[PDB]
Design a protein around this ligand. Structure first.
Ligand SMILES: *[C@@H]1O[C@H](CO)[C@@H](O)[C@H](O)[C@H]1NC(C)=O
Ligand SMILES: *[C@@H]1O[C@H](CO)[C@@H](O)[C@H](O)[C@H]1NC(C)=O
Ligand SMILES: *[C@@H]1O[C@H](CO)[C@@H](O)[C@H](O)[C@H]1NC(C)=O
Ligand SMILES: *[C@@H]1O[C@H](CO)[C@@H](O)[C@H](O)[C@H]1NC(C)=O
Lengths: 317, 215, 163, 87, 49, 98, 48
């Protein structure tokens, strides 16, 4: 029995950019010139708002598949199968599983009109959704996905899953202890594998890094002259006659508009990539977790038996 | 029911607006738009107002932004003031009088500055009575290079002297000189003929410009 | 080499305009623990911003933080339903500006309710606003109904019908 | 009250945004009763209203110094003709 | 305040260069059913044309 | 609407600039208008390309659902409705499928 | 010298209002009556 880890990004940090403050600071003279450039600022704001609502939709689609919050029974005996590493730990206030805690632990620009918006779903609520999915898949099998949750002993569910991959259920019933031991050993090795190899969680981290880099670039591009005498608007205003001030301010306007436009275009492309990843994650949640998949290599390597979700910063494992 | 809007814009022409309306009480609710009546081309300044009795509802106006609705007659039937309440602001942002359920990013909150501070350091005045009123400015080929630093730069003494044929400031606005602080000041004093002054300017090329003194 | 402008007394923890030796800006001046070497005063950060400056007359390091700012969002039901609105100042503590403090920002015009409903209008980190019976109420959104499956070692559930 | 047409542009079934000197909505108008410094500032524009019927008010005066020093503006509305003079 | 140049007969339903009070353009002129108020002279649509 | 923007020029109308301004100094204002309008077109085309990519992804998903849900019975969970899939029926809709 | 409106197209174009400003200045000061030109007449006598 092999337990493999597949890490998929789901959402990226939501950013809102204030066109007027980024491109003109606190000066009305600059804003007057910015007004006649057209409707670029509102276009950028609409694009960013669309990205934010798309990220919220991605998280909701991936994690909120189940409609009822299922709870594991207090007596955690499942025919020798140990789910403590994936089930939530009531001792810690986060109500997160040890694997979830390890993933969470492993994974100013604001001053110029750039803001980060909180996600709609908190980490606690995503963990609660994951715990509901785990409780459903442990107590009810695949029945809760396709309708009302139907009680079934876990060994019988594993026997049906064995029948799904073309293996008779007596193979499970005469080897239940060995199967449980193999599953427990694999689950135990998962945490060590995640801790030892940082390249496994490199996807999600990369996502975060990218956005951070992008934001930094914006701030750095506030220091560019763009052919003007100075990059500071107040210096030009308190140093120049209004006409030459208009000329220099217009140069800065062009530079900062093109900066924001490049940022927004890259942001939309990254949002499309994250949306594709989130659609794949939702499909995996529906097929790997809420049922047994006959598709080869879709749910791990080998004949698929089952799958368990785990919340991760901006992703699902 | 005798609405009269009077404005005087230097964009210098006056404008008068009027509309008569049926009325049963005092200033009622309604969006009866005032149709401009006259646009007299007068150009003298106005700062007062008086009404001749043979009631009196004076109301001052301020720069604001509005959203106006036109029906299928070219008539304004409704309006929204984009600075009255947040609902009107989100109506103006959405460009629709009916706003659906949701959360809308409308404007930005800023904390305005309370007080202005200058902390310029202290007493010593910069030598300007030496560069000017020196009784000899030498020549254009041998012009005096005077270094000015570590002092109070008072440019009023420059204005105190005779009217200037050409007092032209390039990088700095002439009016805003006293506000700015400078690292080092150089005075370049000489005497040249009148007709060659125009050629002494940055970005301008000429015989006197290149063979005598090139900024 | 500065010009004639009589210095004004220094202020603390106030959004003020400052003109220090030609450095013109708007911000809040606070005591800074930064240890400037004697060289000069124009301290700057990674964001290419004049984070700190040393006062010229009295050699003390003052950090310049930007004046508080953010975005305002209007939570409203349908215009036909009601004209009442709530205002969310995002990223701003309520002290700076029916006042409730969410992790998304300061939410004015809405009343917090302990009971949890399904999300109607998103606000932020688990908080949703709704127009319920006749005011805007903010609540921690409910993920769903809590159901416990009666799991036993020898019990199964089998359907008797279909839809 | 105080909404007017900004310019001579026909528009049908449209919402148009105008940045112009307008009387702010729900503002404090000073209602003046005249019983038989009485001058008022002009600022950026003035809104006048009157409910009179028997032509009690018949004109206006605009100016800066209100004497022979500076050009004035006189509007008189008699029963048959409006006369505006900038003498 | 217009000028020497003279007032050609109004040609309708033909792509004709038109100069109305200094406003120059290209297009066909057709009978208009919209009811202008006495005061306006220009008409514009939602696209600001 | 971007045709009404001045883009730093005196007027947004090219005919007005031609009638009023002299060629050597009207060229720069015409260049301002040209660069503004070209940027507007490029922004439109880039947004259009991104939206076209999104629509292509949606259409590929719709084609897969038509092939699997309609022309067969799918054992994939939640791909064809909620529950155990029996069958599916396509219906045309303006610019889409139901 | 025409700055804003080309001399050739004066006849065709229409204008809302015309304002005539008549004065007397020296021959070399005529160039000072032009946008972007600095001089005694420009700043202390008549500013465009
Ligand atoms: C499950 O494993 C943990 C450690 O991995 C162990 O402490 C616990 O006792 C196990 N559960 C059972 C029922 O033995
Ligand atoms: C009005 O204009 C005149 C001339 O332009 C000017 O002298 C005066 O200061 C202005 N203001 C007032 C209140 O008269
Ligand atoms: C308000 O919240 C902000 C959050 O960044 C915090 O920095 C600030 O100290 C808080 N102020 C008070 C008085 O709670
Ligand atoms: C199996 O589950 C039932 C639940 O009713 C429990 O009573 C029983 O003790 C469990 N078996 C073991 C070995 O704990």
């Amino acid at each position: 029995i092999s337990v493999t880890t597949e890490i998929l990004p789901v959402s990226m940090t939501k950013t809102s950019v204030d066109c007027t403050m980024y491109i003109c600071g606190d000066s009305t003279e600059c804003s007057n010139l910015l007004l006649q450039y057209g409707s670029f600022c509102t276009q950028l704001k609409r694009a960013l708002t669309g990205i934010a609502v798309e990220q919220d939709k991605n998280t909701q689609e991936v994690f909120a598949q189940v409609k009822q919050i299922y709870k594991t029974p207090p007596i955690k005996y499942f025919g020798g199968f140990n789910f403590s590493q994936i089930l939530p730990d009531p001792s810690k206030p986060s109500k997160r599983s040890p694997i979830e805690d390890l993933l969470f632990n492993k994974v100013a620009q604001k001053f110029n009109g750039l803001t980060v918006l909180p996600p709609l779903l908190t980490d606690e609520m995503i963990a609660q959704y994951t715990s509901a999915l785990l409780a459903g898949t442990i107590t009810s099998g695949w029945t809760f996905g396709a309708g009302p949750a139907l009680q079934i002993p876990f060994p019988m569910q594993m026997a049906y899953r064995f029948n799904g991959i073309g293996v008779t259920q007596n193979v499970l019933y005469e080897n239940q202890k060995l199967i449980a031991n193999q599953f427990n050993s694999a689950i135990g090795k998962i945490q060590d594998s995640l801790s030892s190899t940082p390249s496994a969680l490199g996807k999600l981290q990369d996502v975060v890094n990218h956005n951070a880099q992008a934001l930094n670039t914006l701030v750095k591009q506030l220091s560019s002259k763009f052919g003007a005498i100075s990059s500071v608007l107040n210096d030009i205003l308190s140093r120049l006659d209004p006409p030459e001030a208009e000329v220099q301010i217009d140069r800065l306007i062009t530079g900062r508009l093109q900066s924001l436009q490049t940022y927004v275009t890259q942001q939309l492309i990254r949002a499309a990539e994250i949306r594709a990843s989130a659609n794949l994650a939702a499909t995996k949640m529906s097929e790997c977790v809420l049922g047994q998949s006959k598709r080869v290599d879709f749910c791990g390597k080998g004949y698929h038996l089952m799958s368990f979700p785990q919340s991760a910063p901006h992703g699902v494992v | 029911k005798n609405l009269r809007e009077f404005v005087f814009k230097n964009i210098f022409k006056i404008y008068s607006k009027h509309t008569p309306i049926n009325l049963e009480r005092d200033l009622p609710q309604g969006f009866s738009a005032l149709e401009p009546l006259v646009d007299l081309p007068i150009g003298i300044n106005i700062t007062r107002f008086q009404t001749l009795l043979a009631a009196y509802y004076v109301g001052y106006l301020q720069p604001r932004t509005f959203l106006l609705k036109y029906n299928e007659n070219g008539t304004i039937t409704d309006a929204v003031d984009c600075a009255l309440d947040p609902l009107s602001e989100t109506k103006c942002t959405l460009k629709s009088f009916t706003v659906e359920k949701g959360i809308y990013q409308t404007s930005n909150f800023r904390v305005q500055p309370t007080e202005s501070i200058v902390r310029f350091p202290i007493t010593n005045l910069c030598p300007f009575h030496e560069v000017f009123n020196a009784t000899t400015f030498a020549s254009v080929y041998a012009w005096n290079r005077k270094r000015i630093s570590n002092c109070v730069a008072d440019y009023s003494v420059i204005y105190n002297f005779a009217p200037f044929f050409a007092f032209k400031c390039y990088g700095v606005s002439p009016t805003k000189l006293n506000d700015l602080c400078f690292t080092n000041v150089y005075a370049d004093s000489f005497v040249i003929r009148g007709n060659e002054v125009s050629q002494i300017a940055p970005g301008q090329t000429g015989n006197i410009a290149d063979y005598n003194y090139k900024l | 080499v500065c010009g004639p402008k009589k210095s004004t007394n220094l202020v603390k923890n106030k959004c003020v305009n400052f003109n220090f030796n030609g450095l013109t800006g708007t911000g809040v001046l606070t005591e800074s623990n930064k240890k400037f070497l004697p060289f000069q005063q124009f301290g700057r950060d990674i964001a290419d911003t004049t984070d700190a400056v040393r006062d010229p007359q009295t050699l003390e390091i003052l950090d310049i933080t930007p004046c508080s700012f953010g975005g305002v969002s209007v939570i409203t039901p349908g215009t036909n339903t009601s004209n009442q609105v709530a205002v969310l100042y995002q990223g701003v503590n309520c002290t700076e500006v029916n006042v409730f403090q969410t992790r998304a920002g300061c939410l004015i015009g809405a009343e917090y309710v302990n009971n949890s409903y399904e999300c109607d209008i998103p606000i932020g980190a688990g908080i949703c606003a709704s127009y319920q019976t006749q005011s805007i109420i903010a609540y921690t959104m409910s993920l769903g109904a809590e159901n416990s499956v009666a799991y036993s070692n020898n019990s199964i559930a089998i359907p008797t019908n279909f839809t | 009250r105080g909404v007017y047409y900004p310019d001579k542009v026909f528009r049908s079934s449209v919402l148009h945004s105008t940045q112009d000197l307008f009387l702010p909505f729900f503002s404090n108008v000073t209602w003046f009763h005249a019983i038989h410094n009485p001058a008022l500032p002009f600022n950026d524009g003035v809104y006048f209203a009157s409910t009179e019927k028997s032509n009690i008010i018949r004109g206006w005066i605009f100016g800066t110094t209100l004497d022979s020093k500076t050009q004035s503006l006189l509007i008189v509305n008699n029963a048959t003709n409006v006369v505006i003079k900038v003498c």
